[PDB]
UniProtKB/Swiss-Prot annotation:
Outcome after substituting residue 402 to V: In strain: Isolate pCV-J4L2S
Residues included from the entire protein: 2420 to 2982 of 3010
Cofactor note text: Binds 2 magnesium ion that constitute a dinuclear catalytic metal center.
Regulation: Activity is up-regulated by PRK2/PKN2-mediated phosphorylation.
Species whose genome carries this gene: Hepatitis C virus genotype 1b (strain HC-J4) (HCV)
Domain named RdRp catalytic: residues: 211-329
Protein residues bound to Mg(2+) 2: 217, 315-316
Annotated function: RNA-dependent RNA polymerase that performs primer-template recognition and RNA synthesis during viral replication. Initiates RNA transcription/replication at a flavin adenine dinucleotide (FAD), resulting in a 5'- FAD cap on viral RNAs. In this way, recognition of viral 5' RNA by host pattern recognition receptors can be bypassed, thereby evading activation of antiviral pathways.
Cofactor(s) of this protein: Mg(2+)
Membrane topology type: Single-pass type IV membrane protein
Reaction catalysed by this enzyme: RNA(n) + a ribonucleoside 5'-triphosphate = RNA(n+1) + diphosphate
Modification type Phosphoserine: residues: 29, 42
PTM text: The N-terminus is phosphorylated by host PRK2/PKN2.
Protein name as annotated: RNA-directed RNA polymerase
Amino acid sequence: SMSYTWTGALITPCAAEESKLPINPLSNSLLRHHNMVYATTSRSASLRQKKVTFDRLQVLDDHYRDVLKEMKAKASTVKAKLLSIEEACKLTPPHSAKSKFGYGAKDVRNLSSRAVNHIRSVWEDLLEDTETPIDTTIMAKSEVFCVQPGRKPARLIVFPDLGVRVCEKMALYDVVSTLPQAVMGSSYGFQYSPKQRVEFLVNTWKSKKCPMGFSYDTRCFDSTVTESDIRVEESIYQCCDLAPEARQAIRSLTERLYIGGPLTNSKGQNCGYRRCRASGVLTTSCGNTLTCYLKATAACRAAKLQDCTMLVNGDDLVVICESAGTQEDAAALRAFTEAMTRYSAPPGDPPQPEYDLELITSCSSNVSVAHDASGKRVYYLTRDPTTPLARAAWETARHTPINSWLGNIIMYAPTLWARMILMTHFFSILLAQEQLEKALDCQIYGACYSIEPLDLPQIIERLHGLSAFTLHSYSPGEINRVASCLRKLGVPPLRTWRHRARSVRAKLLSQGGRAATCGRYLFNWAVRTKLKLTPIPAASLSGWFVAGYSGGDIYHS
Ligand SMILES: CC(=O)N1c2cccc(O)c2NC2=C(C(=O)CC(C)(C)C2)[C@@H]1c1ccc(Cl)cc1Cl
Ligand SMILES: [Mg+2]
């Protein structure tokens, strides 16, 4: 069976779509080579359609059967709980797609009579109708990138109506936030903050007698997900104690929505049909994470890998284990890939055995080493800064509803590029405009958070600890990568950023209060006569690294 069938209707935009980066004074002082930055659009959608459309062989074996049964068994341990409409509503981010049926995201969060009446009716419908496919929209995605020495086609979101998305939360938020950890325990990626993730990868690695590690990338995880997979994923949810309306809701949502369904474009036209995973549902992150864990664990047994530890974030997989020598590790990996391929999880690039942890790239990121204030070697998470920087330049020239620079500052607070460039740049900009006290939207692990940047000292301390304000003496690889990247992009050199930082730092300090605190902590690296950094009393919220809600419709004020 095919991943998608197409009518011929085009994937259509609905606002103006912009591909080229603007030539803006502020972003130009962050990034010069402005032609290199682009945003994907609806014009390349038909390219992605050909990539994402293919037939899917799947052969299941006894290993796959057995992991499944271990998984279900851990799931029957869990008890889930219905959200009230009010709770489900207050989870909806204010810039969600409006409904076909009048009301929009504001009307949901404000509980207007129209929206709630439609939601109630959609809920009633989900309990009463078992079979009618639920319609979805298919839109291209605008995401910015830096060019290749070619250019990526847009990715495609597939999401059901707002009224439906609220109902998903009512019947599944508590499941999707709770069951993945119950099943995979320490393997569940999204329970970890960056610090925590490094702790885990370092521990695991150093506990191995002779460690080998690899990450595995599968072609199009969403299109490779067959309806069988989506059923298995249901059968796991159904091991929970669930109120009877939720059980019935999960049953209808699976049949009607998740297993596949009709696709409409922006203009209302019949577009095609879906038989794999929808990228824009509340169960996409959790479902993927589960399908993935399951297939990888079976393949590990098939491939006879020894002492496998693995960490899973949706479709992103990393595995550390006992080396048996280069030949047989290569051969084991070949077996693992072939086992995975039978499970309808074929690999993009063939996975590569790796004998040093710093060389393992996983969720775009790797561990690196630096030194804290004491001089102790300290491991932290980093990535290549090219894409983060492009999006920073783009979010500078254009107002956008998610600020990836703010997610990158918070996630990569202890990186060289985050500290010298990112912070320096945006505090300068915000300070210019007096918008410092003002709140901004960004996202961690798919869920959307509102954040005042002035609270960055306190947030960083709680996630990373004061160490992040004093890491120094970075590795040469990291410095080289960062530096080669700044030249590629025409981003001014770190030298320049230090000079700028000194000026931001001085100006914040004059402001006093919370701003002066940003100045002392964030920029203590810019001065030689350094300030002593004790904890911030104020820095003493909960669900920040619980689960991953990518594609869900999730918000936190
Ligand atoms: C989809 C998703 O939420 N993640 C993800 C997963 C895999 C690759 C990847 O690049 C990302 N990216 C990001 C993520 C952010 O939190 C925001 C931000 C800005 C750090 C980017 C996030 C992520 C980043 C680093 C790691 Cl180690 C894991 C994850 Cl899930
Ligand atoms: Mg992939």
